[PDB]
Amino acid sequence: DTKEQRILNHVLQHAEPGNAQSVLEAIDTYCEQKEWAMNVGDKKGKIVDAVIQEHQPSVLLELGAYCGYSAVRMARLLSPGARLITIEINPDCAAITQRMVDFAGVKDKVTLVVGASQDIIPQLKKKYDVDTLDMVFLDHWKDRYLPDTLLLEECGLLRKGTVLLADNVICPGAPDFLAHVRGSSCFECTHYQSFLEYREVVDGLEKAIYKG
Numbered sequence: 393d394t395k396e397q398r399i400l401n402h403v404l405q406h407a408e409p410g411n412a413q414s415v416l417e418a419i420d421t422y423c424e425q426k427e428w429a430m431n432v433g434d435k436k437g438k439i440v441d442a443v444i445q446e447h448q449p450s451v452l453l454e455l456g457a458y459c460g461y462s463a464v465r466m467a468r469l470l471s472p473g474a475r476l477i478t479i480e481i482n483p484d485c486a487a488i489t490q491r492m493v494d495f496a497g498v499k500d501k502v503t504l505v506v507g508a509s510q511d512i513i514p515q516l517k518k519k520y521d522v523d524t525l526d527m528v529f530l531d532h533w534k535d536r537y538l539p540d541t542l543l544l545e546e547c548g549l550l551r552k553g554t555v556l557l558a559d560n561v562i563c564p565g566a567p568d569f570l571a572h573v574r575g576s577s578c579f580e581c582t583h584y585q586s587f588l589e590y591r592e593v594v595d596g597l598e599k600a601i602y603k604g
């Protein structure tokens with residue numbers, strides 16, 4: 393019985409099926425008052441809602457699914473016919489992402505890619521019928537932000553106007569990535585100060601728009 397298993401257990405009991413918003417509040421109050429978990433949280437989540445609602449992307453890439461909290465959060469706001477792909481290396485996390493997604497009724501617009509982001513990014517175009525990504529949400533291991541950004545650029549998955557949204561830019565921090573995107577003339581950057589999930593600590597989301 394793992395931590396990620398009780399969180400699905402909570403949703404399966406307290407959340408009402410087919411309602412993406414409900415699941416969200418289930419995951420939030422469980423982690424909020426029983427066990428801490430590396431979900432984006434509601435407070436930066438409300439920012440991703442504002443950012444997704446604005447740029448209204450057709451194809452969106454997530455790096456690191458975990459329990460599907462952010463996959464639910466993003467995909468419940470996608471226009472009809474929009475796709476979200478979510479890369480997750482851990483088979484156990486990837487099995488629970490799917491369940492969570494099924495419960496929310498969001499299984500039809502979210503495609504799970506089970507594997508290491510570095511291995512599947514070069515295979516993204518061909519295997520999954522992908523031209524360019526309208527938006528990338530980075531939230532996997534922090535050492536992989538920069539590598540995978542150059543990897544996404546290399547494979548030509550980055551389009552002029554692509555929105556990279558990066559989590560945990562203050563805590564635990566993604567300093568090499570932050571340094572590259574803010575300094576690069578390929579990226580136009582905005583910071584949104586928020587708060588680390590389930591805590592009174594200052595975190596924030598960095599938005600970086602590729603320019604070519």
Ligand SMILES: C[S@@+](CC[C@H](N)C(=O)[O-])C[C@H]1O[C@@H](n2cnc3c(N)ncnc32)[C@H](O)[C@@H]1O
Pocket residue numbers: 430431432433455456457458459460461462463479480481482485507508509510531532533536
């Ligand atoms: C911060 S959690 C993701 C949280 C999720 N996006 C949310 O906010 O609800 C990090 C997850 O990314 C996965 N991960 C770490 N490195 C990865 C990689 N290189 N490729 C794909 N997934 C990775 C880990 O298994 C872990 O579950």
Ligand SMILES: O=[N+]([O-])c1cc(O)c(O)c([N+](=O)[O-])c1
Pocket residue numbers: 430431432531532533534559560563564589
């Ligand atoms: O432990 N943490 O402070 C976090 C928080 C987070 O929001 C994370 O995404 C994380 N991680 O990617 O492993 C770690």
Ligand SMILES: [Mg+2]
Pocket residue numbers: 430431432531559560
């Ligand atoms: Mg995070």
